[PDB]
């Protein structure tokens, strides 16, 4: 049930099939957390209706954009509209016309995940992030059992809220180091290559938050997979749970995992944490 904007005629349409329009006079902008393509990520509250006021964070598309830039960044409310799920970021609703242009998303206290675990490098038992990414499996089982296919999944593009319930995010708008190769190369993605990006973000999660293959330039990245270079396990990181990694990261798509079977052997692993060696 994954109806594509870009098949639709153009948001304005799409965006309002699937993003509720609210009205900006109940979006109150406390913060900037963040520089985004288009503007300013800020966190605030929003006021529904016989319900206790949310935290939203509110993605802003800056004063003076040109109708392309408006439709390219309301693309974003258009694909996430149409995901209900613990593990995929929940819209709140839009404003497209008439108001300062907005993106109104659930606050996630804890921010996005790399630079969240950068902070509290160290500090979370194997079994936990084990569990951090078993909800970005579940997400991306949704996300992909739905037609969906994320093309730009990492680390920095999952949020984590103040549970470390992490979210699968960033859905806009219809690289090479969280690529596969048949991506790269091929422009073939596909729910095959999600699982590949699945895998870095696996490494970054395990790493606390490092940069996949460090100072190594894209196209050293590229020479090295081909030959059968693989990230290794890091730190404290379990054979199973890197071997999990290697399975991901196959040159056969068709070889690599389904997030249906990633999401059982994380879960396998939380409940008897040894089998991450065995």
Same mark, same amino acid.
Request: aromatic share 8%; charged share 25%.
């Given at each position: 049930?994954?109806?594509?904007?870009?098949?639709?005629?153009?948001? %304005?349409? !799409?965006?309002?099939? @699937?993003?509720?329009?609210? $009205?900006?006079?109940?979006?109150? /902008?406390?913060? +900037?957390?963040?520089?985004?393509?288009?503007?300013?990520?800020?966190?605030?509250?929003?006021?529904?209706?016989?319900?206790?006021?949310?935290?939203?964070?509110?993605?802003?598309?800056?004063?003076?954009?040109?109708?392309?830039?408006?439709?390219?960044?309301?693309?974003?409310?258009?694909?996430?509209?149409?995901?209900?799920?613990?593990?995929?970021?929940?819209?709140?609703?839009?404003?497209?016309?008439?108001?300062?242009?907005?993106?109104?998303?659930?606050?996630?206290? %804890?921010? !996005?995940?790399?630079? @969240?675990?950068?902070?509290? $490098?160290?500090?979370?038992?194997? /079994?936990?992030? +084990?569990?951090?990414?078993?909800?970005?499996?579940?997400?991306?089982?949704?996300?992909?059992?739905?037609?969906?296919?994320?093309?730009?999944?990492?680390?920095?593009?999952?949020?984590?809220?103040?549970?470390?319930?992490?979210?699968?995010?960033?859905?806009?708008?219809?690289?090479?180091?969280?690529?596969?190769?048949?991506?790269?190369?091929?422009?073939?993605?596909?729910?095959?290559?999600?699982?590949?990006?699945?895998?870095?973000?696996?490494?970054?999660?395990?790493?606390?938050?490092?940069?996949?293959?460090?100072?190594?330039?894209?196209?050293?990245?590229?020479?090295? /997979?081909?030959?059968?270079?693989?990230?290794?396990?890091?730190?404290?990181?379990?054979?199973?749970?890197?071997?999990?990694?290697?399975?991901?990261?196959?040159?056969?798509?068709?070889?690599?995992?389904?997030?249906?079977?990633?999401?059982?052997?994380?879960?396998?692993?939380?409940?008897?944490?040894?089998?991450?060696?065995?």
């Amino acid at each position: 049930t994954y109806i594509d904007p870009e098949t639709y005629e153009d948001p %304005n349409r !799409a965006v309002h099939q @699937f993003a509720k329009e609210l $009205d900006a006079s109940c979006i109150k /902008i406390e913060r +900037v957390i963040g520089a985004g393509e288009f503007g300013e990520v800020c966190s605030g509250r929003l006021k529904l209706p016989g319900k206790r006021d949310v935290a939203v964070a509110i993605k802003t598309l800056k004063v003076g954009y040109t109708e392309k830039q408006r439709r390219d960044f309301l693309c974003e409310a258009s694909i996430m509209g149409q995901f209900d799920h613990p593990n995929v970021v929940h819209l709140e609703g839009v404003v497209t016309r008439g108001k300062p242009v907005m993106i109104v998303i659930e606050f996630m206290e %804890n921010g !996005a995940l790399d630079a @969240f675990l950068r902070k509290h $490098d160290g500090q979370f038992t194997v /079994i936990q992030l +084990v569990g951090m990414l078993r909800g970005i499996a579940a997400g991306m089982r949704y996300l992909a059992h739905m037609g969906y296919v994320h093309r730009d999944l990492a680390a920095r593009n999952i949020l984590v809220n103040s549970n470390l319930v992490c979210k699968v995010s960033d859905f806009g708008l219809s690289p090479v180091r969280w690529t596969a190769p048949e991506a790269i190369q091929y422009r073939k993605f596909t729910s095959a290559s999600d699982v590949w990006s699945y895998g870095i973000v696996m490494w970054e999660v395990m790493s606390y938050g490092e940069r996949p293959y460090w100072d190594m330039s894209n196209q050293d990245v590229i020479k090295a /997979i081909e030959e059968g270079y693989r990230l290794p396990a890091p730190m404290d990181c379990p054979a199973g749970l890197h071997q999990l990694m290697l399975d991901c990261w196959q040159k056969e798509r068709a070889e690599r995992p389904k997030f249906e079977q990633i999401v059982g052997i994380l879960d396998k692993m939380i409940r008897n944490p040894n089998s991450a060696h065995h």
